[PDB]
Amino acid sequence: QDSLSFGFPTFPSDQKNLIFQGDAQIKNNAVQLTKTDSNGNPVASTVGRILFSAQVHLWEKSSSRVANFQSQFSFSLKSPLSNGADGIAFFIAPPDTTIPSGSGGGLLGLFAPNQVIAVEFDTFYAQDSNTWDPNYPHIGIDVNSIRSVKTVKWDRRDGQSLNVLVTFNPSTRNLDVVATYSDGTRYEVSYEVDVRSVLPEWVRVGFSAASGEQYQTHTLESWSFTSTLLYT
Amino acid sequence: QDSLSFGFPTFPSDQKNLIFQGDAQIKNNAVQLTKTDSNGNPVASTVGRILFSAQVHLWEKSSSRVANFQSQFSFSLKSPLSNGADGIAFFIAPPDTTIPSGSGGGLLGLFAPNQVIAVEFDTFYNTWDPNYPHIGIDVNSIRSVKTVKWDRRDGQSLNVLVTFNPSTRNLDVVATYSDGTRYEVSYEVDVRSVLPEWVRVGFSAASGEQYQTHTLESWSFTSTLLY
């Protein structure tokens, strides 16, 4: 299909179109990307992801078309500890994408110790961190093997849902990210990217998250998406 | 998802979200539900269907909701015969649905010699005048619970709109040819009484000893659960 749209106001336990990978599963009408115990508390050493089942036709070389798409979602992170980790990310990858061996912790279940576009919301501390202040969490845009090609400082709020809207306009090639808490606190970051140079014509979209020695829940509460091929 | 929609203005050969069953395959940027030879001519004894891969949440008991959905599509039938058979149908069925054994010819690859709702366009020859083709609505194991006379036009595209309103439970069908000729039929149907909460949607077609192409040219669909 040239066009595809879907919306999950919530995530009841009877899901059919989600592909669960790792520890990802539905609990309390939400997708718990990372494992949680009997009490709803997060645990260490966990990675999980979900992908929508239908593949998205991102671009078509034969018609010189590229899709205009938008992904809106909300999540919340909760941790008994003072420094929850590691983060959650919205990503776009080849259809057969699977959790890379050894991609736990700060690798978010997305990178091995490739072809992908992702927007990560990190709360973990990084030694190097050449694109953001390691002393504070950040939102980062990932293009292929370049993580955080662009970032913006962000604040972690235990238990608070963050509303995010990721939009891509093939005309300007701008990948725009806007995130806000319920009080209106807003974070913005955008970067130019020709999706044709990093991703195949057909892809799958979803989310990934992980917790290494430090942990926190990565609760995806809602998600809507739309894509339409446009000439160009 | 509570809502799902997708659109196929055409059907290029590099499909990813279509479950092809039987002889159904892509040719000339269209779905050829029934088999055709090297010259594109229809052949006898063939059955084929397609289903969109993503399941549709038609209704939900927990929240007392039923979806409002619309399915628009266009198809054309062609045959060297003056009595091309047997027909094409848009249908809704359980996600794991497969072509029933011995469902060829007049059974359109939908019925065995059963949870489903379908709108069929029959050209072969009762709740209808066998003297001419007809559009029929099928509910569960009851074929043509209601029908309306229809005219087959070799090689001409028939645009169709099938809609379902949960408030009235009316399943409406409107079909037209490019000259404006219009055919319509509607029937009240509580989807909860014949289909499970999650279903797959698609098309089916078949030709027995009499044949014709069943070419699905385009298809758009949308569904949203409503209170």
Ligand SMILES: CO[C@H]1O[C@H](CO)[C@@H](O)[C@H](O)[C@@H]1O
């Ligand atoms: C101690 O290191 C581990 O835990 C931290 C915090 O969770 C991760 O960033 C890291 O990748 C390892 O998994």
